[PDB]
C-alpha cells in the first residue's frame, strides 16, 4: 500500500522571471548530482554538480528567488562527479575539497554570511589549490571528510591516504575513529586509530561507486547486488529481500528512527531511493525491535497529483488556445515552460497561435518530458526532524514525499482491501461518467449555491432538474442498479457523518509556501472529488430534504468552497500563497515544518480556515 504522496516543488514557480535575479559567478584561474546541506543557523543550502565537472552552484532553499546563487566554475575537470567532493561547514564557512584532473587539490572557503548577503562580488583569495603531494599515475575517485579536520582519500586497487596539508596507513565513519569502508566485490572493512589495522573484514559468503552504506547508532545497513544486508564491535545479522520487476539502480539510502505510520510497534525505518532513467521510486523498510519480528515494505506515490491530473484527464476545475496556453504556463513553473519554448525554437517549430491544435499538443508533450527530466532524482535529504526531501537533477527542483492522511490513503489505494467501501462504490459508479457530465453537475451545484437555480425550488426539485438536464443522458442503467444495490448495504447516515464532521471538516517563506500550497491543493482536490460523488448520489436518487438537510447544505457549501479554491490555484499561485500564509501565520510568513504531524496539522489548519470562511 502506498502511504506517501509526491509533492513537486519548483522554487521559482510563483515568480514569472527565472532564474533568480541575483546570481554570482566565481571563476578560479542538464544535471548530474544535487544535494542539500544544513548550516549552523536554521537554513538549508543546496549545491549541484551538473554537467560532469567544472560546475559548483549554491543557492538557499528558503529564499531561492530573492536570495542569491553562487556559481563556482572550475579550471580543470574532475576524475569523478559528486564523489571527488566533500562539502563541510567549519567555523561558519563551507569547506569545499575537490581533486581536479591536473592532480591538484582545491580547497574552497565559502563564508556563511556571503551566500546570505545581497553582495554581488567579494574580493579575497578564498580559492587556494595544492599542486604537490599527488601524482598522475595514481588518481583517486573518492574523497571522504573525517570529522576531526581530516580527509581520507581512497583509490581503485584497495588503498587509501590521509590529507593533513599527507599521512598514510562506499565508506562511512562509525563512532569517532572507526572508518567502515566498502569494496567492489564487495566486502566491508573496518578502521580505527589504531590507524594501521582493521577490526574485521567480510567474507564473500556467496551461498547465504555509489551510496551503499547507511549507519544509525550501532546498526548498519548495506546493499548486496538485491539483498538488504543488516549488521548490528559486532558485525553480524540477517539480510532481507527486495521487490523488483525490471532493472533498478539505487540512488540514496538513509537509516533513521521510526516515523508516524499505520504499523505495529517498530524499531527502525529505512528510506531507499531507486531510479530507472528519469523515473524514481521511494520505498521504506519498517523494522520491529531487534531486527527480527518484522520487515515491512511501504510504497509511495511516485508521481505528484498534478502529473496524474495531466496524464489521466482526471482534472475537472481547469477551463480556446489562449486560455489553454495560459493554463499550461501556470501549471508548470516558468523555468520548465521557457526550457520547452527554447527546445521547440531549436527544432524550428513556429507557433500557429489562434485555432492551433498540433502546436498545443506538441507543447503539452514537450512540457511533460521537460518536467520528467527536471525531476530526475540524485540524492535524499532529511528535513525538519522527519520530513523527507528528494533533490532533483535540474536546479530549483525538489520533491517532498508527504505522509498521507486517511482520506489521501483511501484515495491513492482504491483497489486494495466501512466508509472506505462506501467511497469505493461511489467512485465505482462515478468513473463511468465523462468529464463533461461531471463539470455540468458541478456547475449545477454552483448554480444551487449562488442562486442561479431558483431557491423557491425544493431541493428535490433542484435535483430532478439537475438529472433531467445533465444525467438525463445515457448512463449505463446496469451501473445504476449496481450502485443502488451496493448502497443498500451501508448505513448511509452514519458514514456520511463520519465523512463530514470528523474526516473532512475539523524566516521568509517561501519554501513553506511551495509545499503548503501543493499539499492543500491535493487535500482539497480529493475532498472535491468525494463531495462531487456524494452529491451525485443525492441527485441520482432523490432523498428527503429532512434526513440530510444540514448534510446537503454543508455539502453544497464545501463543494462551492473547494471549486473556488481550485480555480484560485489555477491562476496566480503567488498571491494565493501570500493570502493563505498571511491569514494563518503570526508573522504572515508561515510555520517551520519540523515533523510530519506538524505539517499535516498546518495543512488541516489551512483547510479549517477554508471551510469556515464567510460565503
Amino acid at each position, epitope marked *: 500500500m502506498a502511504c506517501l504522496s509526491r509533492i513537486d516543488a519548483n522554487l521559482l514557480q510563483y515568480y514569472e522571471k527565472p532564474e533568480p535575479n541575483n546570481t554570482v559567478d566565481l571563476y578560479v584561474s542538464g544535471s548530474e548530482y544535487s544535494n542539500c546541506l544544513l548550516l549552523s543557523n536554521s537554513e538549508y543550502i543546496c549545491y549541484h554538480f551538473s554537467s560532469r565537472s567544472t560546475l559548483l552552484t549554491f543557492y538557499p532553499l528558503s529564499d531561492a528567488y530573492h536570495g542569491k546563487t553562487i556559481n563556482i566554475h572550475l579550471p580543470n575537470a574532475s576524475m569523478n562527479q559528486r564523489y571527488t567532493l566533500t562539502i563541510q561547514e567549519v567555523e561558519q564557512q563551507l569547506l569545499v575539497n575537490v581533486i581536479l584532473k591536473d592532480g591538484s587539490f582545491l580547497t574552497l572557503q565559502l563564508p556563511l554570511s556571503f551566500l546570505f548577503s545581497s553582495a554581488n562580488t567579494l574580493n579575497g583569495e578564498w580559492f587556494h589549490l595544492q599542486n604537490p603531494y599527488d601524482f598522475t599515475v595514481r588518481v583517486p575517485h573518492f574523497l571522504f571528510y573525517v570529522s576531526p579536520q581530516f580527509s581520507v582519500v581512497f583509490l581503485e586497487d584497495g588503498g587509501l591516504l590521509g590529507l593533513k596539508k599527507y599521512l598514510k596507513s562506499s565508506c562511512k565513519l562509525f563512532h569517532e575513529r572507526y572508518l567502515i569502508v566498502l569494496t567492489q566485490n564487495c566486502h566491508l572493512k573496518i578502521w580505527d586509530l589504531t590507524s594501521f589495522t582493521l577490526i574485521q573484514d567480510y567474507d564473500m559468503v556467496s551461498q547465504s561507486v555509489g551510496e551503499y552504506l547507511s549507519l544509525y547508532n550501532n546498526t548498519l545497513v548495506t546493499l548486496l547486488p538485491g539483498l538488504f544486508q543488516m549488521g548490528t564491535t559486532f558485525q553480524n545479522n540477517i539480510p532481507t529481500n527486495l521487490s523488483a520487476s525490471a532493472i533498478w539502480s539505487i540512488v540514496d539510502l538513509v537509516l533513521t528512527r521510526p516515523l508516524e505510520l499505520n504499523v505495529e510497534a517498530s524499531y527502525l525505518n529505512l528510506i531507499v531511493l531507486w531510479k530507472s532513467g528519469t523515473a524514481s521510486k521511494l520505498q521504506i523498510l519498517n523494522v520491529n525491535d531487534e531486527s527480527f519480528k518484522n520487515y515491512e515494505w511501504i510504497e509511495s506515490v511516485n508521481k505528484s497529483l498534478v502529473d496524474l491530473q495531466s496524464e489521466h484527464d482526471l482534472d475537472i476545475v481547469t477551463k480556446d488556445v489562449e486560455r489553454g496556453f495560459c493554463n499550461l504556463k501556470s501549471r508548470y513553473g516558468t523555468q520548465i515552460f521557457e526550457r520547452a519554448q527554447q527546445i521547440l525554437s531549436e527544432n*524550428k517549430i513556429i*507557433m*500557429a*497561435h489562434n485555432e492551433d491544435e498540433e502546436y498545443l499538443a506538441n507543447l503539452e508533450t514537450i512540457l511533460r518530458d521537460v518536467k520528467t527530466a527536471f525531476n530526475e532524482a540524485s540524492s535524499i535529504t532529511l528535513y525538519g526532524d522527519e520530513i523527507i526531501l528528494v533533490n532533483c537533477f535540474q536546479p530549483y527542483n525538489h520533491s517532498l514525499y508527504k505522509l498521507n492522511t486517511t482520506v489521501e490513503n483511501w484515495f491513492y489505494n482504491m483497489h486494495s482491501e466501512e466508509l472506505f467501501k462506501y467511497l469505493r462504490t461511489l467512485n465505482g459508479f462515478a468513473s463511468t461518467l465523462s468529464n463533461d457530465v461531471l463539470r455540468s453537475i458541478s456547475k449545477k451545484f454552483l448554480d444551487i449555491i449562488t442562486g442561479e437555480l431558483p431557491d423557491s425550488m425544493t431541493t428535490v426539485e433542484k435535483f430532478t432538474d439537475i438529472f433531467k438536464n445533465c444525467l438525463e443522458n445515457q448512463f449505463e442503467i446496469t451501473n445504476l442498479k449496481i450502485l443502488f444495490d451496493e448502497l443498500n448495504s451501508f448505513d448511509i447516515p452514519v458514514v456520511l457523518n463520519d465523512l463530514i464532521n470528523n474526516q473532512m471538516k475539523p524566516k521568509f517563506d517561501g519554501f513553506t509556501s511551495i509545499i503548503s500550497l501543493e499539499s492543500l491543493h491535493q487535500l482539497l482536490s480529493i475532498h472535491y472529488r468525494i463531495t462531487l460523488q456524494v452529491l451525485l448520489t443525492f441527485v441520482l436518487f432523490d432523498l428527503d430534504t429532512e434526513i440530510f438537510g444540514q448534510h446537503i447544505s454543508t455539502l453544497l457549501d464545501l463543494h462551492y468552497k473547494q471549486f473556488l479554491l481550485l480555480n484560485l490555484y489555477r491562476q496566480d499561485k503567488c498571491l494565493l500563497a501570500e493570502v493563505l500564509l498571511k491569514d494563518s501565520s503570526e508573522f504572515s510568513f508561515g510555520v517551520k515544518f519540523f515533523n510530519y504531524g506538524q505539517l499535516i496539522a498546518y495543512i488541516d489548519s489551512l483547510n479549517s480556515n477554508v471551510y469556515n470562511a464567510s460565503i
Partner: nanobody, 121 residues
C-alpha cells in the same frame, strides 16, 4: 474559402524601391501569418508570425527589406528598398495550417497570388 490577394509589384531599376501588400478576405484565424517567400524563374521558392511576436528575415535581403503587419489583421506589407537584379523573382504570400516552420515549403495552407517582377540596371 478564404482568398489571399496581393499587389504592389512591377519592374524597377536596380536600387529603386517597391512596396508589396497582401490581405485576406476570409476570417480564418488571427494566427496564421503570411510568409513573403520568393522564387526565381527556374529556381525553388526560397526562405511575421503570431502578431509580430517574432520576425525572421533571409540573408540576401536583411537590412534591405522591411516586413510589417497591422495589429489584429491578416495584412502583410514588404517595403523593398535597394533592389538588385538578384531580387528578380516571383514572390508569394502564405498561410499555415497546424504546426508550421519559417524555413520550409511546408508552411502554407494557401498562398497563391503569384506575381512576376523584374529589375534592370
Amino acid at each position: 474559402q478564404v482568398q489571399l490577394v496581393e499587389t504592389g509589384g512591377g519592374l524597377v531599376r536596380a536600387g529603386g524601391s517597391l512596396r508589396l501588400s497582401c490581405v485576406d478576405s476570409g476570417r480564418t484565424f488571427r494566427v496564421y501569418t503570411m510568409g513573403w517567400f520568393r522564387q526565381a524563374p527556374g529556381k525553388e521558392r526560397e526562405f511575421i508570425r503570431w502578431s509580430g511576436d517574432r520576425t525572421y528575415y533571409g540573408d540576401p535581403v536583411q537590412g534591405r527589406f522591411t516586413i510589417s503587419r497591422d495589429k489584429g489583421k491578416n495584412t502583410v506589407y514588404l517595403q523593398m528598398n535597394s533592389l538588385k537584379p538578384e531580387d528578380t523573382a516571383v514572390y508569394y504570400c502564405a498561410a499555415p495550417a497546424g504546426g508550421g516552420v519559417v524555413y520550409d515549403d511546408h508552411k502554407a495552407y494557401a498562398y497563391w497570388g503569384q506575381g512576376t517582377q523584374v529589375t534592370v540596371s
